[PDB]
Structures are given as structure tokens and as C-alpha cells.
Amino acid sequence: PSSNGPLEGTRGKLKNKPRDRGTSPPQRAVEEFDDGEKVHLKIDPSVPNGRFHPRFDGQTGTVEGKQGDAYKVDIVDGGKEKTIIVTAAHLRRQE
Amino acid sequence: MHALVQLRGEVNMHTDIQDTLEMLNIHHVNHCTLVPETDAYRGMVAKVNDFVAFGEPSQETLETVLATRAEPLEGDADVDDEWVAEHTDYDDISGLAFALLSEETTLREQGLSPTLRLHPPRGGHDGVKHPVKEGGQLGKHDTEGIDDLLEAMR
Amino acid sequence: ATGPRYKVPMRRRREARTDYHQRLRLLKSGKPRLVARKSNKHVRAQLVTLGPNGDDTLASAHSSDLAEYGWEAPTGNMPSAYLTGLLAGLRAQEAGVEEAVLDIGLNSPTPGSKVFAIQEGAIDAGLDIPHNDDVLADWQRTRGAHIAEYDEQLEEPLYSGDFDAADLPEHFDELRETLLDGDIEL
Amino acid sequence: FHEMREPRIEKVVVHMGIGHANAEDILGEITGQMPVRTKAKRTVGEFDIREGDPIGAKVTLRDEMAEEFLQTALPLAELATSQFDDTGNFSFGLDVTVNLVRPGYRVAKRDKASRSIPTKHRLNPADAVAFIESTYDVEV
Amino acid sequence: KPASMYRDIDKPAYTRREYITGIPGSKIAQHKMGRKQKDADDYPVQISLIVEETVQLRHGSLEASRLSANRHLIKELGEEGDYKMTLRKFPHQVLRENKDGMRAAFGKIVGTAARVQAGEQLFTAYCNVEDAEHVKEAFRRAYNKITPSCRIDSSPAGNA
RNA sequence: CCUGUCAAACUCCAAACUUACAGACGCCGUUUGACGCGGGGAUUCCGGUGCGCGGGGUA
RNA sequence: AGUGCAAGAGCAAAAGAUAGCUUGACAGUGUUCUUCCCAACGAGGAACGCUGACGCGAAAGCGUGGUCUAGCGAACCAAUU
RNA sequence: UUAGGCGGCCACAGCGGUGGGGUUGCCUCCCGUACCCAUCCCGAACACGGAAGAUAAGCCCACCAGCGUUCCGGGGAGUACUGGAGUGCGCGAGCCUCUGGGAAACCCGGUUCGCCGCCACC
Ligand SMILES: [Cl-]
Ligand SMILES: [Cl-]
Ligand SMILES: [Mg+2]
Ligand SMILES: [Mg+2]
Ligand SMILES: [Mg+2]
Ligand SMILES: [Mg+2]
Ligand SMILES: [Mg+2]
Ligand SMILES: [Mg+2]
Ligand SMILES: [Mg+2]
Ligand code: NA
Ligand code: NA
Ligand code: NA
Ligand code: NA
Ligand code: NA
Ligand SMILES: [Sr+2]
Ligand SMILES: [Sr+2]
Ligand SMILES: [Sr+2]
Ligand SMILES: [Sr+2]
Ligand SMILES: [Sr+2]
Ligand SMILES: [Sr+2]
Ligand SMILES: [Sr+2]
Numbered sequence: 001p002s003s004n005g006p007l008e009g010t011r012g013k014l015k016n017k018p019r020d021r022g023t024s025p026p027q028r029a030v031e032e033f034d035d036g037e038k039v040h041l042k043i044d045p046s047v048p049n050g051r052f053h054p055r056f057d058g059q060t061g062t063v064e065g066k067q068g069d070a071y072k073v074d075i076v077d078g079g080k081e082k083t084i085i086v087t088a089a090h091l092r093r094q095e
Numbered sequence: 096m097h098a099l100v101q102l103r104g105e106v107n108m109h110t111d112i113q114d115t116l117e118m119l120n121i122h123h124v125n126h127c128t129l130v131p132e133t134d135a136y137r138g139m140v141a142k143v144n145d146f147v148a149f150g151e152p153s154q155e156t157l158e159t160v161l162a163t164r165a166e167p168l169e170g171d172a173d174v175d176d177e178w179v180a181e182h183t184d185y186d187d188i189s190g191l192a193f194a195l196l197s198e199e200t201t202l203r204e205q206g207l208s209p210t211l212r213l214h215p216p217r218g219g220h221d222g223v224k225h226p227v228k229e230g231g232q233l234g235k236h237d238t239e240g241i242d243d244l245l246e247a248m249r
Numbered sequence: 250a251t252g253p254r255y256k257v258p259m260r261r262r263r264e265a266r267t268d269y270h271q272r273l274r275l276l277k278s279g280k281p282r283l284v285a286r287k288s289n290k291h292v293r294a295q296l297v298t299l300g301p302n303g304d305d306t307l308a309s310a311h312s313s314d315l316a317e318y319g320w321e322a323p324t325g326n327m328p329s330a331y332l333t334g335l336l337a338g339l340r341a342q343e344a345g346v347e348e349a350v351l352d353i354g355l356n357s358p359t360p361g362s363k364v365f366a367i368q369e370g371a372i373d374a375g376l377d378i379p380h381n382d383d384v385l386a387d388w389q390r391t392r393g394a395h396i397a398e399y400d401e402q403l404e405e406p407l408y409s410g411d412f413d414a415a416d417l418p419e420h421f422d423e424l425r426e427t428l429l430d431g432d433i434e435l
Numbered sequence: 436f437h438e439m440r441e442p443r444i445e446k447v448v449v450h451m452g453i454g455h456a457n458a459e460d461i462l463g464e465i466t467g468q469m470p471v472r473t474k475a476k477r478t479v480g481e482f483d484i485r486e487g488d489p490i491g492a493k494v495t496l497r498d499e500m501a502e503e504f505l506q507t508a509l510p511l512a513e514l515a516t517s518q519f520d521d522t523g524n525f526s527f528g529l530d531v532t533v534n535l536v537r538p539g540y541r542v543a544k545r546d547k548a549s550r551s552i553p554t555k556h557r558l559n560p561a562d563a564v565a566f567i568e569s570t571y572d573v574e575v
Numbered sequence: 576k577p578a579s580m581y582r583d584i585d586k587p588a589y590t591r592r593e594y595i596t597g598i599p600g601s602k603i604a605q606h607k608m609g610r611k612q613k614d615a616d617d618y619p620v621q622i623s624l625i626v627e628e629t630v631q632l633r634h635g636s637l638e639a640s641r642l643s644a645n646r647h648l649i650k651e652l653g654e655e656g657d658y659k660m661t662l663r664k665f666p667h668q669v670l671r672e673n674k675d676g677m678r679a680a681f682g683k684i685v686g687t688a689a690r691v692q693a694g695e696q697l698f699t700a701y702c703n704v705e706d707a708e709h710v711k712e713a714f715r716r717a718y719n720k721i722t723p724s725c726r727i728d729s730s731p732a733g734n735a
Numbered sequence: 736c737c738u739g740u741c742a743a744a745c746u747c748c749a750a751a752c753u754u755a756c757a758g759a760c761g762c763c764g765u766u767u768g769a770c771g772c773g774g775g776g777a778u779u780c781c782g783g784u785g786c787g788c789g790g791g792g793u794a
Numbered sequence: 795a796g797u798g799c800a801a802g803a804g805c806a807a808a809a810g811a812u813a814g815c816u817u818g819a820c821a822g823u824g825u826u827c828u829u830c831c832c833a834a835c836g837a838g839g840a841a842c843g844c845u846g847a848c849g850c851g852a853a854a855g856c857g858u859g860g861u862c863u864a865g866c867g868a869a870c871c872a873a874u875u
Numbered sequence: 876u877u878a879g880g881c882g883g884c885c886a887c888a889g890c891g892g893u894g895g896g897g898u899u900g901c902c903u904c905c906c907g908u909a910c911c912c913a914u915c916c917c918g919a920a921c922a923c924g925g926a927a928g929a930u931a932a933g934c935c936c937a938c939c940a941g942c943g944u945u946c947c948g949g950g951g952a953g954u955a956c957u958g959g960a961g962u963g964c965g966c967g968a969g970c971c972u973c974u975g976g977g978a979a980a981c982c983c984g985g986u987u988c989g990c991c992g993c994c995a996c997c
Pocket of ligand 7: 873874
């Protein structure tokens with residue numbers, strides 16, 4: 001890459017499909033998850049805050065608690081265990 | 096139930112393809128194994144499609160090979176009808192051959208090594224650089240084609 | 250509408266019925282919502298909770314079913330609104346609900362208005378609802394005093410269908426008196 | 436059917452597009468109510484680079500205030516077909532605009548469940564000329 | 576410059592003018608010849624020159640082939656003959672040349688070419704049953720001025 | 736309306752395929768102790784070739 | 795369109811505009827990620843918390859600067875609280 | 876749901892169009908400014924108070940496909956492209972065969988003029 005900031009090469013993954021453009025529905029921004037639940041991580045282009053590092057888009061982690069209204073999700077980056085702080089708006093239950 | 100025989104060596108073959116063979120219990124050239132026709136196994140053989148020869152053998156052929164190449168999970172004990180009867184849930188080889196072909200049991204379940212260590216093909220094979228439809232020996236065979244191979248390697 | 254790339258607002262947005270930005274902030278409380286609404290003739294209070302396939306109303310009251318307890322007056326005024334909130338509130342307490350956040354939809358936060366009267370009502374019923382006293386109309390107005398004095402400037406009865414001539418805020422009292430009473434069939 | 440279809444006057448907006456005001460006083464007399472300042476947008480070569488600043492004034496009249504104005508304002512104009520909108524509005528002259536519409540226009544001016552007025556309920560130039568002409572004056 | 580330098584499709588598509596400046600002008604004079612006021616449908620015969628290999632044709636080559644082709648159609652049918660020929664391709668691919676060793680080698684802009692897939696029609700003519708051989712001859716001359724071998728395929732024409 | 740063409744820094748579409756998690760089968764581990772963890776010792780940080788996909792360059 | 799400035803991205807009862815008010819561009823201390831994919835490494839950065847004190851709002855709530863990704867600096871020493 | 880409120884999905888729901896519906900019921904338009912409140916000017920809106928009138932708007936109900944969208948059949952197409960393999964072809968750029976996957980445009984015929992949840996209600 002020519003540069004190395006967090007949003008490097010994220011044109012696609014952080015752009016909205018034209019029809020999904022505009023403020024997102026509140027339901028998924030208020031969704032509650034339980035410890036142990038499996039959640040897919042996917043940033044919502046329309047939601048500015050509560051995001052994780054784009055590099056983690058597509059991970060399916062495990063909720064292990066929360067910090068304020070955000071959730072602490074456990075994932076394994078390659079072989080390294082990491083904890084990700086992420087709000088409901090960027091999460092989806094698995095299955 | 097299809098019979099798998101490795102006909103192409105490990106040198107230069109993709110590692111994920113080599114691990115697939117090993118998971119299918121084959122670790123040498125000319126070694127044959129019997130695999131149930133499930134979706135899971137289907138993907139596996141499809142992946143090793145270019146380094147093997149497979150197909151469904153006839154009851155008789157399976158019986159010939161078992162008689163001549165089947166082995167105990169351990170030991171050099173010869174495997175014949177008496178061995179089969181005194182060690183398996185069948186009366187003789189045929190009962191085993193039938194249960195295998197009908198996918199009711201596996202060589203392991205009956206205290207037999209999952210692998211049949213065949214002999215080089217008498218009179219050679221059709222070549223390992225081309226598939227069956229092109230005159231080679233690789234890929235899926237006719238029950239008659241597979242029987243020809245398995246018998247020449249009895 | 251125009252083409253593949255055209256962006257159509259969410260249904261409740263086209264219908265101009267739901268302010269999604271306010272809704273979100275509302276839902277962040279984690280508490281139930283005291284949905285205060287009003288029509289030209291009626292007032293409706295609902296205690297809504299969040300659900301998998303849509304909201305869930307746990308309790309509610311309509312100004313219409315106010316008569317069911319002794320109300321012969323119009324149902325689109327301050328006294329009506331307060332009592333409706335209180336009734337809805339009381340029913341709320343019955344269903345196990347104990348706290349709420351005022352959701353006034355697309356109505357304006359005007360001091361002393363009806364949605365605020367609905368709120369004062371629901372609060373008196375025993376419901377814990379974040380509020381601010383100096384934005385609520387003074388007691389008398391809630392009772393309906395402002396209307397009596399309006400009928401004072403008579404010459405022609407305020408109400409067509411005779412409920413009375415000089416109107417009665419004292420009736421409001423009789424009704425509230427009845428509602429705060431245990432007996433009452435909620 | 437006709438009672439809820441027969442036109443009316445929503446608003447009469449008198450205004451003087453000056454360009455730098457002192458004229459508020461006359462409007463406050465010819466109409467009857469307070470006028471409002473008029474701000475401009477975009478910079479303009481004609482010594483008009485100041486974005487927000489007085490440049491005009493207008494007065495929107497409704498109900499009686501509107502009619503009591505037109506009674507003495509309309510006679511001061513020679514209305515014509517062209518001088519009309521595609522919506523049924525007309526403005527003559529100091530500008531004088533008349534906004535005509537059918538009964539329930541509120542449906543598009545209210546906050547809750549507002550909605551656009553169907554083309555059928557939209558007033559027409561012909562339907563407008565009629566109503567007006569049908570009250571103290573002629574057309575073209 | 577030899578065409579061997581640019582005839583192959585061995586480089587990314589380079590056509591974005593918003594990121595490329597100094598692009599030389601095309602040498603192709605016209606893309607529609609003959610009587611262009613008339614429709615191609617008004618002719619009983621339609622013959623195309625088809626490329627047999629995928630390649631790149633520099634605008635200099637298009638101009639030469641188109642020229643030596645139409646020029647023949649003019650000499651044999653007149654400056655107003657009843658026919659019409661079309662060069663359906665345009666040179667969108669910008670070409671470079673590194674003209675200082677291999678250091679900072681990105682080349683300067685030197686021309687344009689049209690990418691033609693094998694089997695495609697480069698030229699297409701429409702004529703009357705009479706001048707069918709005159710157009711077949713114009714094409715023979717044209718394919719002698721472009722890299723690939725070509726097929727002179729006759730579309731509407733059952734007058735054999 | 737018709738008719739002629741395009742895009743590494745275009746996209747109304749859209750693969751093969753790569754990839755997170757889980758279950759199943761396979762293989763493996765519980766005297767051959769896997770997975771994980773702590774500690775000692777390194778060597779290494781001129782690479783090359785084929786194939787696939789490339790970017791530069793006439794090559 | 796606008797949103798200070800590259801580019802790509804976000805935003806419409808707003809993240810834009812206008813008006814009014816206000817100083818959260820606040821103090822203390824963390825979690826996590828990033829910097830440095832995997833995989834150890836500082837300064838710097840971000841998201842998300844707790845505590846304290848405040849602003850605005852009816853209230854939910856918003857405000858840990860400017861919608862997001864650039865605008866940055868070790869030890870020793872000096873000045874400062 | 877003989878007209879209501881709060882929603883979930885967020886065009887299969889859009890755009891446009893046709894027909895039907897309301898005496899003390901519902902929603903509205905509607906009537907009206909003493910109060911709470913309101914317009915940098917306007918009871919337009921916001922807010923409050925109310926029933927003389929009305930179903931013309933809106934809204935709800937029934938429906939139409941011309942545009943947009945969703946899905947489906949048939950054709951394009953097992954084409955384009957492609958993971959694995961080859962002492963197959965080609966001067967070469969490149970192509971072919973076997974194995975496993977597999978489009979897009981577009982045409983023709985259908986589908987689509989919302990679906991669903993909670994509450995309230997002759
Ligand atoms: Cl993160
Ligand atoms: Cl309402
Ligand atoms: Mg990309
Ligand atoms: Mg042994
Ligand atoms: Mg051979
Ligand atoms: Mg120093
Ligand atoms: Mg200092
Ligand atoms: Mg009607
Ligand atoms: Mg060769
Ligand atoms: Na969105
Ligand atoms: Na001013
Ligand atoms: Na140099
Ligand atoms: Na740091
Ligand atoms: Na109606
Ligand atoms: Sr190249
Ligand atoms: Sr040639
Ligand atoms: Sr990749
Ligand atoms: Sr921010
Ligand atoms: Sr009015
Ligand atoms: Sr050559
Ligand atoms: Sr298939």
C-alpha cells in the first residue's frame with residue numbers, strides 16, 4: 001500500500017450499496033447479545049461510531065461481556081487472540 | 096462405494112491434495128482404499144481426482160483383492176474365509192465384500208487395515224499423464240475398467 | 250422509483266409517521282416507551298416495549314374508554330389527556346411495568362401541552378418517568394379550568410351537545426378520584 | 436363535492452424587492468400587519484457581496500387581512516391569462532402574489548403524516564381565473 | 576516504431592483520460608464511409624473483415640488499412656458509389672515508450688490502439704450484388720496493413 | 736429515435752475462488768500426552784527455478 | 795448541494811442551513827485495538843468504559859474538538875502548574 | 876384493523892392510474908383563537924378549544940403493470956470466466972482436452988400495485 005492508515009484499501013468494504021444508503025434502522029443498533037453468543041462482525045457504512053478495525057470485517061467472534069453499551073467480542077486474528085470493542089450496529093447473530 | 100488407488104507419487108503434488116490422500120488412509124503409490132459414497136468423501140476424491148484411479152468394483156473383483164491383499168489391523172496373519180469368519184461379523188470374504196460395497200461396515204470396523212497394498216499392474220497401466228476418456232488411467236472408471244486395474248494389481 | 254440506484258425512504262418515513270433519529274435515542278434508554286399520541290377528537294397513551302418482529306404494547310388507554318368510568322365530556326382536551334395517561338399508567342403498573350421514557354412522536358414539546366399532561370398522568374399512576382415539572386401545565390389547567398373561564402365569556406354555550414352550560418372541572422376530579430381508587434375495573 | 440372543491444385564498448404576499456428597508460413603513464400601512472426583512476444568498480458583482488443582510492421586505496396575509504387587501508389591490512391591476520401559474524396562482528405588480536388552493540391544503544402543510552396534494556386536487560389556471568374573475572373584475 | 580512493440584495484449588487496460596495527459600491525436604480520418612445518409616439495411620450484401628487473432632491495432636494502422644480499402648471502393652465505385660463501409664473500432668488503449676537506463680522507466684505517452692478480439696468484425700461494408708467483388712478486393716488490401724490474418728466473411732449474400 | 740465503440744485509479748450486475756465460525760465425516764491425541772504454556776540453545780534476515788496471477792520494460 | 799484542505803468513504807424531519815444558547819477543545823483513571831495483519835517493539839492515534847465537574851434539551855440523549863482515515867517527536871536539561 | 880396507534884423487514888413496499896367508503900362510531904379535511912403555546916410577519920404551521928359542514932384531499936378498501944423493483948420459466952448458455960490435472964496443439968501472443976464450479980447483458984412469457992408482528996376497536 002502507498003500509505004498505512006486504518007482505512008487503507010477499504011473503498012469497497014466501507015461503501016454502501018446505493019440502496020442501503022442513508023441512516024440505518026435502529027433495531028440492530030439496540031439489539032442485545034448474551035455472553036457466549038456467536039456474532040458476525042461487519043461494519044455498517046452508515047454508522048460512524050462503535051466500529052472496529054476494518055481489517056477484522058468478516059470475523060465471527062464470541063461475546064464475552066460489554067463495556068458501556070458496546071460489546072467485547074473475542075476473535076482469533078490468524079493465531080493471535082484479540083478482544084474487540086464493538087457496538088451492536090456492526091454485529092449480527094450467527095445462524 | 097468406490098475403490099481408490101494412488102497412481103501418482105507425492106513429489107510435486109499440492110500439499111492439501113497430499114494430506115487429503117493421507118486422510119483417506121493412502122500413503123504410498125499403488126495403495127488402495129475403499130470409500131463410501133457420501134458428499135463429504137465425494138469432495139475428497141474429486142480433489143485427488145488427478146493423482147488417483149477410482150470407481151465401483153464388482154463383488155467378485157473386491158473379493159479377489161481382499162483375499163490377496165487384505166491385512167489385519169496388526170500382524171502378518173493371512174486373511175481368508177476362516178480369518179474373516181473367526182474375526183468379523185461375516186461368514187466369509189463374500190459377506191464382507193457385500194457389506195463393504197453396500198456401505199454397511201468398513202475394514203477398520205472389522206479389525207482390518209483400511210488399506211490394501213496392491214502390486215504394480217501386470218502388463219502396465221494406461222499412463223498417468225491422461226484421464227480415462229483420453230486413454231489414460233487417472234480419474235473415475237467403469238466398473239469394468241476398475242476391475243481390470245484392480246485385477247492386474249491383485 | 251426513477252431507477253436501480255434510487256433510494257426510497259423506509260416505509261414509516263415516507264408515511265411521515267416515525268422520526269427514526271428520535272426513536273433511536275429513545276430506545277437507548279433500555280426502558281419502555283410511553284407513546285403519547287393525539288387525534289382531533291381523542292388522545293391515546295401506550296406503554297410500548299421492543300420486540301423481535303415489531304414493538305409490543307404492554308398496556309394502553311384511549312380517551313374513548315374514559316366514559317367507561319363516568320365521563321360525558323369531550324375527549325380531546327387537557328383533562329381528557331391527563332386522565333387518559335393516568336388510566337394507561339395504572340394499567341401499566343398492573344402488567345408489571347414500573348418505568349418509562351416519554352415518546353411524543355412528531356408532536357411538539359410545547360410547555361403545558363397534552364402529551365405532557367399524559368405524562369403527568371402516567372407519572373401519578375406510579376410510573377417512574379424522566380420529566381421536568383416546569384414544562385407541565387399548572388394543575389388548574391389540567392383540571393380544565395381554562396375551559397370553564399372560556400365558557401364564562403358565554404352568550405352562547407361552549408359545548409353544543411349539552412354536557413352542561415358552565416362546564417365542570419369538578420367532573421375531572423370525580424373521574425381522577427375514581428381512577429386513583431383501588432376497586433376500579435382496569 | 437363542490438363545497439370541498441371550491442377554491443379560496445391561502446395567502447397574499449406583498450413584497451418589495453429592493454436591494455439594500457426604509458420601505459417597510461408603507462407596506463405596514465397598505466396591508467395592516469408587520470413586514471419581514473429579506474436576506475440574500477450568493478455574492479453578487481453589483482456591490483452585493485454581503486451574504487446575510489436586508490435587501491427587501493414582505494408581508495404574508497391570510498383570511499380577512501388577505502381579502503381586505505385584494506379588494507383594493509386587484510382593481511390596481513390588469514390581470515391576464517399568461518400572468519397565471521400552472522398551479523392556479525397569479526402575481527401582479529412592489530409585487531403582489533396570491534396563493535389560491537382547495538380546502539384541505541393542510542395535508543401538505545402539517546407535520547404529522549403530511550402528504551403531497553394529488554394533481555386532481557391541485558387548482559388549475561382555468562379553475563383559478565374563474566374563481567377570481569367570479570369576484571370583482573375581469574380576466575385576460 | 577515496429578508494431579511488434581505493441582501488437583500484443585500484454586499490459587493492463589490504459590484508457591483513463593482523467594489520469595493521462597499528452598495523448599496524441601488519432602490518425603483515423605473517418606469511421607463511416609460511402610453514403611452515410613443511407614441505412615445499411617438498404618443493401619442486399621453485407622461483408623465484414625474478421626480478425627483471426629486477438630491483437631492491438633495502432634491508430635496509424637487503422638488509418639492505413641481503412642484508407643487503402645475505401646480508396647479502392649472510390650476508384651471502383653466512384654466518389655459517390657452506392658455503398659457504405661464502417662470501421663467499428665476506436666483506439667482507446669493509450670501506448671507508451673520508455674524513451675536513463677531502467678531507472679524510472681514508466682514510458683512517456685506516444686499513441687493509441689484498438690484492442691480487437693479474434694473473430695470480431697473490424698470493418699463491415701454494405702453493397703449491391705454488383706460491387707460484391709470490389710469490396711472483397713478492398714478488404715484484401717486492408718488486411719495486408721494490419722498485424723493478424725483475417726477472414727473476409729460475407730453476411731447477407733445468397734447470390735453464389 | 737436510430738446507429739459505432741470503451742475504462743488500473745467506472746459499476747445496475749457478477750463468478751470460479753479465498754476467507755471467519757460452527758456441526759458432520761475423515762485423520763490425529765489421551766503409556767508415542769496431542770492443543771496450549773514456561774524456559775535453554777540456535778541457525779537465519781545475498782536466494783534461485785517451474786507453474787498460476789501479476790506491475791514496469793521493445794525485450 | 796453542503797459539510798475548512800488530497801483522495802476514497804459517511805450524512806437529508808441530518809452529520810447540511812439558519813437562529814439562539816454554550817464552552818465537553820473539561821479533570822482523574824482505565825479497557826481494547828492500532829502503530830507493528832499473522833507475530834515481539836516506543837511515541838503517536840482511535841474506539842469504548844468508570845469517576846468528578848459541567849453545557850444544552852421536556853426527556854430519552856448528545857458533547858472525551860472539527861463526519862471518517864494525514865496535521866507528528868525519546869533520554870538528559872530548562873521553564874512552568 | 877366500516878377508516879386507529881406503535882412497529883419489524885426497508886421499493887415484492889417506488890412512480891403513475893381507475894373504482895368504492897363514512898348522521899350522534901374511527902381517522903381526517905373542517906369550525907374557531909379566551910386560555911398553555913406559537914409565527915425574525917402571518918392561529919399557514921406549531922399549540923390550544925371545538926363539532927355547522929364534508930367524503931372533494933388525505934386515509935382505508937378493491938384493482939390496473941405503462942415506468943422502476945423482486946422472484947420465476949424458457950432462450951441466451953453450460954456460453955463468458957474459472958479451482959485441479961496434462962510429454963495435448965501453436966513460431967508465438969495464445970489455445971485445447973479431462974475433472975469440479977459457473978455468470979452478465981438481452982429477448983419472450985409469468986410474478987410483484989407489499990409481507991409480517993404487538994395493541995386497541997361493531
Ligand atoms: Cl478493533
Ligand atoms: Cl400524534
Ligand atoms: Mg477494489
Ligand atoms: Mg501390519
Ligand atoms: Mg505412456
Ligand atoms: Mg541532546
Ligand atoms: Mg516552558
Ligand atoms: Mg372519491
Ligand atoms: Mg510446442
Ligand atoms: Na444504511
Ligand atoms: Na435582517
Ligand atoms: Na540517473
Ligand atoms: Na500508544
Ligand atoms: Na376522502
Ligand atoms: Sr507485460
Ligand atoms: Sr496481416
Ligand atoms: Sr486473494
Ligand atoms: Sr467524531
Ligand atoms: Sr384555519
Ligand atoms: Sr515469431
Ligand atoms: Sr452445476
